[PDB]
Amino acid sequence: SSQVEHPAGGYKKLFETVEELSSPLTAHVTGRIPLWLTGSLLRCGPGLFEVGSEPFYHLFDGQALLHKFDFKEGHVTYHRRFIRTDAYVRAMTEKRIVITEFGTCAFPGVEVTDNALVNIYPVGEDYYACTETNFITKVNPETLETIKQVDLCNYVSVNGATAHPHIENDGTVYNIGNCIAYNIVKIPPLQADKEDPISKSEIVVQFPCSDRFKPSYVHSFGLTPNYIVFVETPVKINLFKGANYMDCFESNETMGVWLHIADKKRKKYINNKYRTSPFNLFHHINTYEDHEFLIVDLCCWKGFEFVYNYLYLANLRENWEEVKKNARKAPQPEVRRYVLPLNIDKADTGKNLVTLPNTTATAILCSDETIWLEPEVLFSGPRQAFEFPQINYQKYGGKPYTYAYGLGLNHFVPDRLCKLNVKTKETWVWQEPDSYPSEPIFVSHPDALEEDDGVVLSVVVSPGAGQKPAYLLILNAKDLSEVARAEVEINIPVTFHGLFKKS
Amino acid sequence: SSQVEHPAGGYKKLFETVEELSSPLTAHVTGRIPLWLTGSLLRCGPGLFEVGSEPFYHLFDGQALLHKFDFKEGHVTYHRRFIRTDAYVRAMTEKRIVITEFGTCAFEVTDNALVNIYPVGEDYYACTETNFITKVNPETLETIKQVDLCNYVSVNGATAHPHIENDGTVYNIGNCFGSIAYNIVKIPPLQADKEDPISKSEIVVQFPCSDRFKPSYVHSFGLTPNYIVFVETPVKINLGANYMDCFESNETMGVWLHIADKKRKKYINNKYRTSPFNLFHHINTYEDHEFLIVDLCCWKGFEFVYNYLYLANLRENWEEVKKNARKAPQPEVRRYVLPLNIDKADTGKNLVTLPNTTATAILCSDETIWLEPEVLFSGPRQAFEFPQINYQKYGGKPYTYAYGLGLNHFVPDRLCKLNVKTKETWVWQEPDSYPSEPIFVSHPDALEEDDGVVLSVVVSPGAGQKPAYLLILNAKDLSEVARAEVEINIPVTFHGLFKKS
Ligand SMILES: CCCCCCCCOCCOCCOCCOCCOCCOCCO
Ligand SMILES: CCCCCCCCOCCOCCOCCOCCOCCOCCO
Ligand SMILES: [Fe+2]
Ligand SMILES: [Fe+2]
Ligand code: NA
């Protein structure tokens, strides 16, 4: 949890417009940048929160800004360019808001936003900035130049895809989108023919929907070597409904949460009716197989009200006492472990199927064949969210693991970095006053023997008058002890997701 | 949690018949018994697990044995006598099982008071969960008389966990014919007229039932100055059969929570709902602004946990005990927060605006209030059970500390302290040592909540030790202060009290 209040209101600088750079800046290093840290921290976020006198209203509306911290021989540069999306280009052309964003209607067929402010991921030799629509934007990871807009609907049958695709070691990309059903998209690795892997995209498996005409909002999903896990939440999209995307969301009060598993290799939906209490879910932490059970670690919000209702910029820009009051009635954040039994024996009807020796998670087989799940709580703090979770993904993604790293939210304000041991539930915290960090990204030491042998990288906004406005933070992944910072002389707004590109 | 396995199977001595004493034994003290500790630790449990060649089958079937550890000037005595119930007397007379027990059919409702003992006026009553409570002499352990609560108030039975206010007022709950309902019994304090307070018993409030003909099993309930809290679980009573044979699990209802205004004697029609669990022991309940804090020892699932407490299963070797518990409900300490002020304008939102909890209460359109708990403690088949607090000063009030018996696959093998604010735990544990419910005794001049000792009866069947002892831990850190060792075995005990003198 946080041990800090924010009366000075410095968090408002997260939601303030900035200018892009013409070329990279030098960043003043304090401490020692690891000499093995060679590559680029690439991150996406909103950078322009108004077009002249026309404001963007929601956190997910601001125009995509691509950030890069380059590391080489203990030296750091910072560069950023706005992504030349239809949304951005047409806004600069017409000097107004042209395309409707998540929570901001544009005034005068349907022009869906391509504002790729959320994440960036590799496909073959290419990198794509994304939002949660059918439009992803190919970007140059060295110059940050915008290359091309790609419409996924040209290639596969989905209305959109999440900003959280899973990426196997061979470069295979998995994603999910509604079409009502939910389709798993598989993009293969780059072949010897060297054609665009997106032109070889296919639907491998389909998940059914709880409502014939209303798909659940899906932000992320789980992947193991053998299984795909999809969590159907009571946050529903109502297509029937000057409207924006936010206006289409409603809460189903009665359904609670339905969990779904598919056989990855046999490409089959498994008709196991996993059920539990209502929660919002944005980020899966990790998923793995343990005997005949799937371990499903989730960042949950307890309730069926859409958490995005609390992320309007006008509310996030209020003074600290008003920010805390606004969050009082919001869903409570909680890290939960669910355990999904794969072998359901009818003889065990009415009993707990989770026979694993190291968990308090339960799965009750009911007479109607529904399997009622109770979680093991890994972390819980009052309006203290362990969010934007990251692991040692390359080596422990989809596999038994011990450690997760997170951004700590204090009434939705990011004010700390967190490490969670998911086996012992021990936590580590890094926190300084009037300092607002981003999602921590783990980079392994090249000679790593342990899971947490490496560093986490975070972009920190420090608007305190006796400090430079922002810096790149490097923590030791062992104990979250500071290793170095690279300070820059310009402000950096909020960033959501990113990756470390090794070179 | 426990850090111990039990391959030697010493826990079997918890479920072995013992003989009563004709007079108290001296107990060899190691360490120092506090000189302010003056009174009697009274505890109830099964003592006779067969009548000749006829066995009792269930943990809650053995014939009531009343235990007493007396403390005075740093010296300890141990005494025990079988309670002369109808069940016991008729069994000794006929040399067989006469009365049907919880999980043993006889080939007449049981009065086998093996569960708890509590004060009413100047008197002490051993109880089970029936209409029959047994007046006992707390000094000699002599059985005085049988009391039928049905003679006085409209209940089919009452729990072994009555709440007792500082003035001596006794509250209890039992199912009744309202169409089935649950009645709260109030027994007043002893008046100047000095007549039996049980003859002045009355029903103050009635809770409705989820099923017209099937009452939920109720083991305990919550009490605050202003409120009564009742948790209706999916474990239902469906009326050569015994009591166990009547229990079934309602798969669809989950858990219904109920509040009544204590002083205005009114049921409040707030439809609190959550996921299914078994509940035996409330830890504590208290009021915090317009919210009730409800701390519970829960078992996650709707299967009756009592299904796992047959003596044949509890007497198995350790590897078989652990395997038997694999598919059982998981124990978990949970904090629920019940909002008292429900505004329709907050429909679809979390009503729990308290700053120090992660517990939620969602107001639904059908006016159901869906609860999610804050988890205070969770360990794999490691139950924090038989909870105790500084009851006299913190019962029904804001509090920090709970003490518990730690169950390891249902085997008691440790003593636990829980800080319910920080979730920090303390453990006391020795190999091949099986303790009982810890009872907190305050230093008489204490201003702080945990300024005192906890008392536990420990079975230590290890060949290089005396068979049992009274354990005294410092309530601050559960560090050992003294033990009083006895040269005879003591079977399992459930509940009790410290009677100050
Ligand atoms: C530093 C960031 C923290 C401040 C905000 C608090 C976040 C609360 O946690 C919620 C986690 O949200 C998920 C993170 O990803 C954010 C981007 O995803 C939403 C993008 O939606 C735009 C798509 O809309 C068009 C599709 O219909
Ligand atoms: C030293 C303790 C070790 C016991 C191990 C098993 C305990 C599992 O936890 C469950 C707690 O059970 C409640 C504690 O109270 C015990 C007695 O309550 C049950 C009495 O039921 C008798 C009912 O008989 C009459 C039916 O109408
Ligand atoms: Fe996200
Ligand atoms: Fe009990
Ligand atoms: Na500090």
Task: Tell me, in angstroms, the distance from the centre of ligand 3 to residue A412's CA.
Answer: 14
Count up the domains in chain A and report the number: 1
CA gap B211, B180 in Å, rounded: 8
In eight-state DSSP terms, residue A21 is P
User: B497 and B118 in contact (C-beta within 8 Å)?
Assistant: yes
Q: Report the Cα B389 to chain-centroid distance in Å.
A: 12
Amino acid at B220: S
Query: Could you tell me how many helices (H) and strands (E) chain A has, helices first?
Result: 4, 36
DSSP string, A201-217: -EEEEEEE-SSSS-PBP
| B446: its two tokens | 């204490």
Q: Which helix (H) or strand (E) holds B333?
A: strand B330-339
Residue spans of beta strands (DSSP E) within A34-132: 39-48, 50-51, 54-55, 63-72, 75-82, 119-123, 126-130
Residues of B with Cβ-Cβ distance to A341 under 8 angstroms: none
CA gap B248, A350 in Å, rounded: 10
The half-sphere exposure of A55 on its side-chain side, counting CA atoms within 13 A, is 8
CA gap B240, A146 in Å, rounded: 82
| B194: its two tokens | 């000095």
Burial of A357 (0-12, 13-18, 19+ CB in 10 A): exposed
Three-class SS of residue A229? Answer: strand
CA gap A281, A302 in Å, rounded: 9
CA gap A244, A249 in Å, rounded: 10
DSSP string, A150-184: EEGGGTSS-S---S--EE-TT--EEEEEE--EEEE
Q: How far is CA A197 from CA A138, A152, A192, A202, A203, in A?
A: 13, 12, 11, 10, 14
Indicate which residue's Cα is closest to atom 20 of ligand 2.
B60
A29: Cβ contacts below 8 Å, ≥ 6 apart: A74, A75, A76, A484, A485, A486
Return the C-alpha torsion angle A127, A129, A131, A135, nearest 10: -70
Burial of B247 (0-12, 13-18, 19+ CB in 10 A): middle
Give the technique used to solve this structure. X-ray
CA gap A160, B419 in Å, rounded: 48
User: B378 and B418 in contact (C-beta within 8 Å)?
Assistant: no
Three-class SS of residue B92? Answer: helix
Q: Which ligand is nearest to the CA of B305?
A: 2
CA gap A99, A86 in Å, rounded: 8
Beta strand pairing call for A146-151 and A166-167: unpaired
Residue A353 bridge partners (DSSP): none
Task: Tell me, in angstroms, the distance from the centre of ligand 2 to residue B218's CA.
Answer: 12
CA gap A439, A407 in Å, rounded: 5
Indicate which residue's Cα is closest to atom 21 of ligand 1.
A60
Q: How many CB pairs under 8 A join A and B?
A: 105
User: Distance, in angstroms, between A277 CA and closest chain B CA?
Assistant: 7
CB atoms inside a 10 Å sphere around CB A151? 12
CA gap B476, B495 in Å, rounded: 22
Any ligand 1 atom below 6 A from CB of A132: yes
**Length of chain A (residues):** 503
Any ligand 1 atom below 6 A from CB of A118: yes
Three-class secondary structure assignment of B112-143: CCCCEEEEECCEEEEECCCCEEEEECCCCCCE
Contact between chains at B349 and A329 (C-beta distance less than 8 A): yes
CA gap B219, B221 in Å, rounded: 7
Q: What are phi and psi of B278, to 5 degrees?
A: -80, 140
Among A308, A388, A413, A495, say which to mutate for ligand 1: greatest number of ligand atoms within 8 Å of CB.
Answer: A388
Residue B459 bridge partners (DSSP): B434, B468
Q: How far is CA B478 from CA A316, B38, B199, B439, B481, in A?
A: 46, 20, 42, 12, 9
Three-class SS of residue A329? Answer: coil
Indicate which residue's Cα is closest to atom 18 of ligand 1.
A118
Q: Report the Cα A309 to chain-centroid distance in Å.
A: 17
| A493: its two tokens | 């707004």
Burial of A219 (0-12, 13-18, 19+ CB in 10 A): buried
User: B366 and B377 in contact (C-beta within 8 Å)?
Assistant: no
Q: Residue A348: closest CA among chain B residues belongs to which residue? A: B327
Three-class SS of residue B281? Answer: strand
Contact between chains at A360 and B330 (C-beta distance less than 8 A): yes
Q: Residue A367: closest CA among chain B residues belongs to which residue? A: B251
| A253: its two tokens | 């009060």
CA gap B358, B421 in Å, rounded: 12
Three-class secondary structure assignment of A375-396: CEEEECCCCEEEEEEECCHHHH
Contact between chains at A361 and B330 (C-beta distance less than 8 A): yes
Q: How far is CA B155 from CA B182, B210, B214, in A?
A: 8, 18, 15
Beta strand pairing call for A403-410 and B54-55: unpaired
Closest C-alpha among B446, B453, B356 to residue B403: B453
Three-class secondary structure assignment of B403-467: EEEEEECCEEEEEEEEECCCCCEEEECCCCCEECCCEEEECCCCCCCCCEEEEEEEECCCCCCCC
User: Distance, in angstroms, between B134 CA and closest chain A CA?
Assistant: 37
Measured between its terminal Cα atoms, the distance across chain B in Å is 35
Q: Which ligand is nearest to the CA of B45?
A: 2
Annotated binding-site residues of B read 161, 219, 281, 495
């007046």: which residue's tokens?
B135
CA gap B108, A120 in Å, rounded: 75
User: A27 and A9 in contact (C-beta within 8 Å)?
Assistant: no
Interface of A with B (CB under 8 A): 251, 253, 276-278, 302-305, 328-334, 348, 350-355, 357-362, 364, 366-368, 372, 374, 376-377, 380-383
CA gap A408, B7 in Å, rounded: 44
Beta strand pairing call for A222-223 and A202-208: unpaired
Measured between its terminal Cα atoms, the distance across chain A in Å is 35
Contact between chains at A253 and B330 (C-beta distance less than 8 A): no
Beta strand pairing call for A235-237 and A202-208: unpaired
CA gap B368, B446 in Å, rounded: 43
Closest C-alpha among B373, B379, B378, B351 to residue B254: B373
Q: How far is CA B359 from CA A291, A333, A376, B176, B473, in A?
A: 33, 10, 15, 33, 32
CA gap A426, B186 in Å, rounded: 46
A233: Cβ contacts below 8 Å, ≥ 6 apart: A216, A217, A257, A278, A279, A280, A281
User: Distance, in angstroms, between B495 CA and closest chain A CA?
Assistant: 26
Any ligand 1 atom below 6 A from CB of A56: no
Q: What are phi and psi of B412, to 5 degrees?
A: -75, 120
CA gap A348, A243 in Å, rounded: 50
Task: Tell me, in angstroms, the distance from the centre of ligand 3 to residue A389's CA.
Answer: 9
Any ligand 1 atom below 6 A from CB of A282: yes
User: B349 and A329 in contact (C-beta within 8 Å)?
Assistant: yes
Three-class SS of residue B269? Answer: strand
Q: Residue B305: closest CA among chain A residues belongs to which residue? A: A351
User: B20 and B64 in contact (C-beta within 8 Å)?
Assistant: no
Q: Which atom of ligand 1 is nearest to the CA of A118?
A: 17
Three-class SS of residue B15? Answer: helix
Q: Report the Cα B295 to chain-centroid distance in Å.
A: 14
Q: Report the Cα A358 to chain-centroid distance in Å.
A: 28
Beta strand pairing call for A370-374 and A268-276: parallel
CA gap B231, B217 in Å, rounded: 10
A36: Cβ contacts below 8 Å, ≥ 6 apart: A445, A446
CA gap B257, B236 in Å, rounded: 15
Contact between chains at A350 and B374 (C-beta distance less than 8 A): no
Closest C-alpha among B298, B360, B419 to residue A382: B360
Breaks (C-N over 2.5 A) in chain A follow: 108, 179, 241
Buried b (16+ CB within 10 A) or exposed e, A443-456: bbeeeeeebbebbb
Contact between chains at B362 and A278 (C-beta distance less than 8 A): yes
In eight-state DSSP terms, residue A94 is H
Q: Which domain holds residue B380?
A: 1-501
């659940």: which residue's tokens?
A216
Contact between chains at A305 and B379 (C-beta distance less than 8 A): no
Describe the strand order of the beta sheet including A403-410 as a list of residue ranges.
A384-390, A403-410, A413-421, A427-430
User: Distance, in angstroms, between A262 CA and closest chain B CA?
Assistant: 25
CA gap A397, B292 in Å, rounded: 42
Q: Which helix (H) or strand (E) holds A352?
A: none
Q: Residue A254: closest CA among chain B residues belongs to which residue? A: B364
Indicate which residue's Cα is closest to atom 13 of ligand 1.
A282
Amino acid at B8: A
**Length of chain B (residues):** 501
**Computed over its alpha carbons, how large is the radius of gyration of chain A?**
22
User: Distance, in angstroms, between B331 CA and closest chain A CA?
Assistant: 8
The shares of helix, strand and coil residues in chain B, as percent rounded to the nearest 5, are 10, 45, 45
| A63: its two tokens | 């125009």
CA gap B190, B469 in Å, rounded: 36
Expressed in Å, this structure's resolution amounts to 2.1
Residues of A with Cβ-Cβ distance to B337 under 8 angstroms: none
Three-class SS of residue B400? Answer: coil
Q: Which atom of ligand 2 is nearest to the CA of B110?
A: 25
Closest C-alpha among B78, B81, B139 to residue B466: B78
